[PDB]
């Protein structure tokens, strides 16, 4: 049986983890207590288990966000052994999460990985949820990703890392943690997907008319992106996109594995009735820069490979028409070495709505994950923040004292400059 | 399961910390007797950060009280919320240091250090996973500025991986409360730069302007200033005791607010302050607290923050608020006046939220600022030093207790080194 | 040790120039470094001890803490360079009453303090290189009523450049100094 | 080349050479920070 083991690391990992497993349980009808709703029925409910346990691990070195799950509305879905806590958090330090205090828990975390790998029949991939701005997301994320490549081969690793916004941040050592974490995602992660908090705010503010959004409103639609991309494994459809279909069609080269994301029908409950939502106009709104989860302009770069994943009652006739209308637009630019630039997946299940959630019931949705050379636009802004802070060598005695050396700063910076060069070389075109 | 040892030294540390445990007992529902009487489970989820469970289910504070004069502990013990503390923790002397740093740090305080460090070691080893040691004291005095900094130096050798939150009041600019304020302040700051991990700076005069201009208290008593100081101390530790969308512990603040190992002096301020004549007209929102947060008159430090650039500022928001309002207001305060912020650190603001506001308020915020304008405070005390140092006035009381005059020149040459790097970081530019 | 191996006149305890300079001396560093650097004015290889903290980094002549040293000579001569920084050295002696008395000189103090067990001393030095003539018998006779017998420990914990520390019976100037003990070579 | 080196050394004064021993280094600093232009040129050469 096809399956994916997910790993949620840090503050942002398991707050999305509360949101993603909220949507996962509603998609399959799983109740919050874990049991999906004559002598066998008594046997199946009490002595045996009709309970479904998630194949996730919720690990963080700070217990406050972990015990919220242990005491929340989903206390019975997860195994008590499955959620991992710690004494002291990595505390906005890649040095603590990767060398000093992340080393003690990463041995315990892989033991629960081994139990989840033995429980499954056939494994397909790994989902990693973390934030590259925090110490636990960067440090313990890099430590877990480094070890997962050692014990496990041919099993892909999917990354959904919340990268920092260019303008607003909730931390000051934010450029340092992301630069050091970036070198680990290039080396050890098969597919990484950028996520930007400021872009989610603009989607919530404009297309969903919420003036005062919080992290609960952000994670509800990030979970919509995560649930849609793995939805071809859970449900059947006219065209399927497996987790190995996703690698083989969105990384032309091994180093380029950074993809954007977009969800097309972000329409509120009041605005839904007036809106006509067919396949032709949601795909036009899918490529809209206001509808992207990364604060970047895709017109700056050019798309290399793009995957349009559809949910609901979508015929294959009109997704091809949406492909043709996008390819003829002069603003959406493709690179010249990828003529067949699209992969289309259709899932017959309409997107479920979280009860009390902001999104309305729509019968059509597009989850657009695209490989573009506009990722180098994101990493260039984050590089210039790193160069100014490293010139004065501030916030370095925290990293140097807790195990790291000075040479790791220049080493991870040099890898990112190669990626800046890598996009400018791959995105180059041949004309006449 | 993260937990902080409280250490109160001197008359100032005991009086402020008596008011500090008033807020913490009321926030966690602990009655005057000590027993739990909270109305919410979230208060009881993290009590072990500050309180140790005893017999009968009542909780004693994890506080160690030290002063060489028995007068101050009589007021703390016999006063309200005074029966919660443990009498074994009341480690205290008889002779009296008497405003002398030499008596508190070398001669008279030393016979009590082996006693106070014994009960701190008992409190530290018994509890499971420490954070640091929160210490409240003064710098103009000699009993708390003297004996307190000896513990801070000694507790750094025993536990070097734990932090030192120090809340030290400084000499006032307009007035002196002791004649030997420049002696004790310079000699204690030098003992704090290499020992204390992070320092919060307070003074009486900045709180006097807060109590009069904003709170409209024409007769602000001795505990009214302590209530404002106690509200700051609870606001620093708010993410530890209670959950939130963005929790930030003590180590997250110091890794963000400290760019270089000696720039660890901070100015603080509590945002939602208003008089009862204007309580019903204030619209408590994220823009309203942010407007009061960044104002110079709200800071509890004598240094005017308009004079220098904020190297790093942090705010510990509390209340059921949206993160984007917290995000966009602190993004806007950088862009409107970018001259008053430093330029070579992008994203100066450390923002974090706690979902439980304090009792009686629907929204609150606690602000920490690492501004280079605080060099005006150290420049003033050093200016008062060299005027008094050049005549050996009030100096034989310090050298009569075995102290060399080298430690005076040792102290201010670290004070002059401290004010020199503050000036050079403000002047420095990138590209 | 060093009781049977007694030499008449001088007794060199540590010389920087050689195949292995730190032959008998234990080493200890903490936020500092020990570095054999050829200086500028002498152009000769001298050992250097550097540290941000004085009390953390040190070198002691007896390697094992339990073992003791023995020199009956009443003079200790150290040739050190003044780095315009903290210097600190410490000599422990065994007196007439079989008691251990530690004379500990430093650059960061200006007044001498005589505790019943440890005496603390100021040190003032000239600009460049220097030799210091610590008179063991005279210093122990000034500090206490007893007289010198032997030196158990010698230990420099400082920021300095050392070469040619040794023991002497009496004051010996340049013209009667032995061949390889000069460091000046007039 | 030796004559040029001697001409340089006649004015460059006796430089304190690196230690052949380097007996102990508690912080383990290792290599030092390169200058800005030299570091930029070296990074450009490495990326080329």
């Amino acid at each position: 049986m096809r399956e994916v083991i997910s790993i949620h690391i840090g503050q942002a990992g398991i707050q999305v983890g509360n949101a993603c497993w909220e949507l996962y349980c509603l998609e399959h009808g799983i109740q919050p207590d874990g049991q999906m709703p004559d002598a066998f029925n008594t046997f199946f409910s009490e002595t045996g288990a009709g309970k479904h346990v998630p194949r996730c691990i919720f690990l963080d070195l700070e217990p406050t966000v972990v015990d919220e799950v242990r005491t929340g509305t989903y206390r019975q879905l997860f195994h008590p052994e499955q959620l991992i806590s710690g004494k002291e958090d990595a505390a906005n330090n890649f040095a603590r999460g990767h060398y000093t205090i992340g080393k003690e828990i990463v041995d315990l975390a892989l033991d629960r990985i081994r139990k989840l790998a033995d429980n499954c029949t056939g494994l397909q991939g790994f989902l990693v949820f973390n934030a590259v701005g925090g110490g636990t997301g960067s440090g313990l994320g890099s430590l877990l990703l480094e070890r997962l490549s050692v014990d496990y081969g041919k099993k892909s690793k999917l990354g959904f890392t919340v990268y920092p916004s260019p303008q607003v941040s909730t931390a000051v050592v934010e450029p340092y943690n992301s630069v050091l974490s970036t070198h680990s995602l290039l080396e050890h992660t098969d597919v990484a997907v950028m996520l930007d908090n400021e872009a989610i705010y603009d989607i919530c503010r404009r297309s969903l008319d919420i003036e005062r959004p919080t992290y609960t409103n952000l994670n509800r639609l990030i979970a919509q992106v995560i649930s849609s991309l793995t939805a071809s494994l859970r449900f059947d459809g006219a065209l399927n996109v497996d987790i190995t279909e996703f690698q083989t069609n969105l990384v032309p080269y091994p180093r380029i594995h950074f993809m954007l994301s977009s969800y097309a029908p972000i329409i509120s409950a009041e605005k839904a009735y007036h809106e006509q939502l067919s396949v032709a106009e949601i795909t036009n709104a899918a490529f809209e820069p206001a509808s992207m989860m990364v604060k970047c302009d895709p017109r700056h770069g050019k798309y290399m490979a793009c995957c349009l994943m559809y949910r609901g009652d979508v015929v294959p006739k009109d997704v091809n028409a949406s492909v043709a209308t996008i390819k003829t637009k002069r603003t959406i630019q493709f690179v010249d070495w990828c003529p067949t630039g699209f992969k289309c997946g259709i899932n017959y299940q309409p997107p479920t709505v979280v009860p009390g959630g902001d999104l309305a019931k729509v019968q059509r949705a597009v989850c657009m994950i695209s490989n573009s050379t506009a990722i180098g636009e994101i990493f260039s802004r984050l590089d210039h923040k790193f160069d100014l802070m490293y010139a004065k060598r501030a916030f370095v005695h925290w990293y140097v004292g807790e195990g790291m050396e000075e040479g790791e700063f220049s080493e991870a910076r040099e890898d990112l400059a190669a990626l800046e060069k890598d996009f400018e070389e791959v995105g180059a075109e041949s004309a006449e | 399961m993260r937990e902080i040892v409280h250490i109160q030294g001197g008359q100032c540390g005991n009086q402020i910390g008596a008011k500090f445990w008033e807020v913490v007992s009321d926030e966690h529902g602990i009655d005057p007797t000590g027993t739990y009487h909270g109305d919410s489970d979230l208060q009881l989820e993290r009590i072990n950060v500050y309180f140790n469970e005893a017999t009968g289910g009542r909780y004693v504070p994890r506080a160690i009280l030290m002063d060489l004069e028995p007068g101050t502990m009589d007021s703390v013990r016999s006063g309200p919320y005074g029966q919660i503390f443990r009498p074994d923790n009341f480690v205290f002397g008889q002779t009296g240091a008497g405003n002398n740093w030499a008596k508190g740090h070398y001669t008279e305080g030393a016979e009590l250090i082996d006693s106070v460090l014994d009960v701190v070691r008992k409190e530290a080893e018994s509890c499971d996973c420490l954070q640091g040691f929160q210490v409240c004291h003064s710098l103009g005095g000699g009993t708390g500025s003297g004996m307190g900094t000896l513990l801070i130096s000694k507790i750094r050798e025993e536990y070097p991986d734990r932090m030192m939150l120090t809340f030290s009041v400084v000499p006032s600019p307009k007035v002196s409360d002791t004649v030997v304020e420049p002696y004790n302040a310079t000699l204690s700051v030098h003992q704090l730069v290499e020992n204390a991990d992070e320092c919060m700076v307070l003074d009486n005069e900045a709180l006097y302007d807060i109590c009069f201009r904003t709170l409209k208290l024409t007769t602000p008593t001795f505990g009214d200033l302590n209530h404002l100081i106690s509200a700051v101390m609870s606001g620093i530790t708010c993410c530890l005791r209670f959950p939130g969308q963005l929790n930030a512990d003590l180590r997250k603040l110091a890794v963000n607010l400290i760019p270089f190992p000696r720039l660890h002096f901070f100015m603080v301020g509590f945002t939602p302050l208003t008089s009862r004549g204007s309580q019903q007209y204030r619209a408590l929102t994220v823009p309203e607290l942010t407007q009061q947060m960044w104002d110079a008159k709200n800071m509890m430090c004598a240094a005017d923050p308009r004079h220098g650039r904020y190297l790093t500022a942090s705010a510990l928001f509390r209340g059921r608020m949206s993160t984007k309002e917290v995000d966009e207001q602190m993004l806007n305060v950088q862009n409107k006046n970018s001259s008053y912020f430093v330029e070579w650190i992008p994203n100066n603001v450390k923002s974090s939220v706690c979902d439980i506001p304090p009792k009686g308020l629907k929204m609150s915020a606690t602000f920490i600022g690492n501004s280079t304008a605080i060099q005006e405070m150290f420049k003033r005390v050093s200016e008062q030093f060299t005027a008094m140092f050049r005549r050996k006035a009030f100096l034989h009381w310090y050298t009569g207790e075995g102290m060399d005059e080298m430690e005076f020149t040792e102290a201010e040459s670290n004070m002059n080194d401290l004010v020199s790097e503050y000036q050079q970081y403000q002047d420095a530019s990138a590209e | 040790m060093f009781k049977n191996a007694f030499q008449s006149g001088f007794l060199s305890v540590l010389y920087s120039i050689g195949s292995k300079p730190l032959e008998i001396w234990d080493k200890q560093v903490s936020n500092g470094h020990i570095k054999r650097i050829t200086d500028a004015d002498i152009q000769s290889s001298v050992l250097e001890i550097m540290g941000q903290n004085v009390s953390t980094t040190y070198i002691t002549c007896p390697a094992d803490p339990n073992k003791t040293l023995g020199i009956k000579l009443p003079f200790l001569v150290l040739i050190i360079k003044n780095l315009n920084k903290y210097f600190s050295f410490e000599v422990q002696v065994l007196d007439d009453k079989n008691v251990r008395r530690r004379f500990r000189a430093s650059n960061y103090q200006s007044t001498t303090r005589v505790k019943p067990f440890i005496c603390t001393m100021p040190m003032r030095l000239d600009s460049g290189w220097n030799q210091i003539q610590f008179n063991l018998s005279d210093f122990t006779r000034r500090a206490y009523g007893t007289n010198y017998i032997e030196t158990l420990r010698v230990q420099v914990h400082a920021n300095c450049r050392i070469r040619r520390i040794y023991f002497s019976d009496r004051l010996y100037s340049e013209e009667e100094l032995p061949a390889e003990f000069k460091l000046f070579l007039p | 080349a030796a004559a040029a080196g001697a001409a340089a050394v006649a004015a460059e004064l006796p430089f304190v050479e690196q230690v052949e021993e380097v007996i102990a280094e508690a912080p383990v600093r290792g290599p030092p920070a390169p200058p800005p232009a030299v570091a930029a040129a070296q990074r450009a050469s490495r990326l080329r």
Binding site: - | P261, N416, D417 | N84, N107 | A33
Partner: peptide
């Protein structure tokens, strides 16, 4: 008679002025 950060340039030569002020 006659590359490095600003904090390190202060800290290296700070002990010389520690001596010199006395």
């Amino acid at each position: 008679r006659r590359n490095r950060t600003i904090a390190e340039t202060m800290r290296v030569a700070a002990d010389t002025r520690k001596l010199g002020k006395f």
